[PDB]
């Protein structure tokens, strides 16, 4: 099944009548609109390409404009593809709504996590710090040894080291979908989903379920 | 800590590939005074986007 392209609004909480507080991520899912419908014949696979949001007509480029124009649709902030299953047809101008998620119970939300920048091994890989005292010289959060002497005589590939942490695609799976609000174009899912406030989020029905 | 073989001159050259400077793309000309200057900076006489912002 296809998914939608929301925006992370923020977190809040839904008190139940029973007493339970449910922590929700508010995902604003304005109307995703189809641009392109790919197939086995021309493109080699079934999929739909969708867009969402608005964009400055002065800041959308010519080629971008043309693509949208062909579709017969407004220029949105991006383009996103969704592979179609057997028996999933979609027309080119068609607009999909959060209404689509009313039947589903769980979702996989996918997005670009917050960027920590250059992170050391303690933050990045949970490396245990070395001793804060007892003689320890200039080597408190340093990663320790990184190999074995002479054989293999090299650091192995994939060695856990400091480096760029976050700002990368992550998928949280099986998040229970609390509320679908078609009126306000909202989707409340339980629990935290990746990335900062205002970030794009791809919501899909959960693959494992 | 230190090299085992003197690195080549070729190697050095390669290293300094990227060391080259970039000349300013193009200077801007003030609409009033007609005198060249960096974009968004005042001119040497003291004009900016036409009007004389600072007296000499």
């Amino acid at each position: 099944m296809i998914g939608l392209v929301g925006k992370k609004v923020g977190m809040t909480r839904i008190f139940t009548e029973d007493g339970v507080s449910i922590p929700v991520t508010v995902i604003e899912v304005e109307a995703n609109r189809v641009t392109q419908v790919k197939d086995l014949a021309n493109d080699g696979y079934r999929a739909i390409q969708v867009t969402t949001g608005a964009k400055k007509a002065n800041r959308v480029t010519k080629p971008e404009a043309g693509h949208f124009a062909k579709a017969g649709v407004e220029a949105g902030r991006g383009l996103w593809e969704f592979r179609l299953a057997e028996g999933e047809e979609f027309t080119v101008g068609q607009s999909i709504s959060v209404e689509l998620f009313a039947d589903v119970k769980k979702v996989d939300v996918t997005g670009t996590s917050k960027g920590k920048g250059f992170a050391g091994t303690v933050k990045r890989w949970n490396f245990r710090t070395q001793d804060a005292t007892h003689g320890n010289s200039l080597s408190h959060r340093v990663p320790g040894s990184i190999g074995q002497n002479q054989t293999p005589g090299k650091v192995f590939k994939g060695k856990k080291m400091a480096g760029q942490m976050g700002n990368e695609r992550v998928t949280v799976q099986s998040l229970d979908v609390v509320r679908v609000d078609a009126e306000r174009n909202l989707l409340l899912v339980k629990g935290a989903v990746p990335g900062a406030t205002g970030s794009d989020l791809i919501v899909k029905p959960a693959v494992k379920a | 800590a230190v090299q085992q073989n003197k690195p080549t001159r070729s190697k050095r050259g390669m290293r300094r590939s990227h060391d080259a400077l970039t000349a300013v793309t193009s200077l801007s000309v003030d609409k009033t005074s007609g005198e060249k200057h960096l974009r968004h900076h005042i001119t040497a006489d003291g004009y900016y986007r036409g009007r004389k912002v600072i007296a000499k």
Binding site: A196 | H41, I42, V53, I54
Partner: protein, 119 residues
């Protein structure tokens, strides 16, 4: 990291920074135009403009506050008697940055910061 954080440190401790902003602001008030490094100038907007705003509403308490902020009586007077009634109508934007090339001794980007209704 520093997501959402405000303020430039400016390779100074806090107290020193505060002092310099007090001085710089005062100088600006006095002269209505000063040349300074660009970042510093930028920083100054968030000290001077608020002072100016404060000076619009002339009260004893307000005056006292201004003094506390700045600590030159002359400066305070200038703010209250001249600058406040000058910028009375203006909503924000009392000051202006004007990038002016690069300092000789250390290639620091300079910039004139000046009060808006100067000339």
């Amino acid at each position: 990291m520093r997501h959402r954080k405000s303020g430039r440190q400016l390779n100074r401790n806090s107290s020193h920074r505060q002092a310099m902003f007090r001085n710089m602001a005062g100088s600006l008030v006095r002269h209505e135009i000063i040349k300074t490094t660009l970042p510093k100038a930028k920083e100054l907007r968030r000290v001077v403009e608020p002072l100016i705003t404060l000076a619009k509403t002339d009260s004893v308490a307000n005056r006292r506050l201004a003094f506390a902020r700045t600590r030159d009586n002359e400066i305070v007077a200038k703010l209250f008697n001249e600058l406040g009634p000058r910028f009375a109508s203006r909503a924000g934007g009392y000051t202006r940055i004007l990038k002016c090339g690069f300092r000789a001794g250390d290639n620091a980007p300079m910039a004139y910061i000046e009060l808006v209704d100067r000339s």
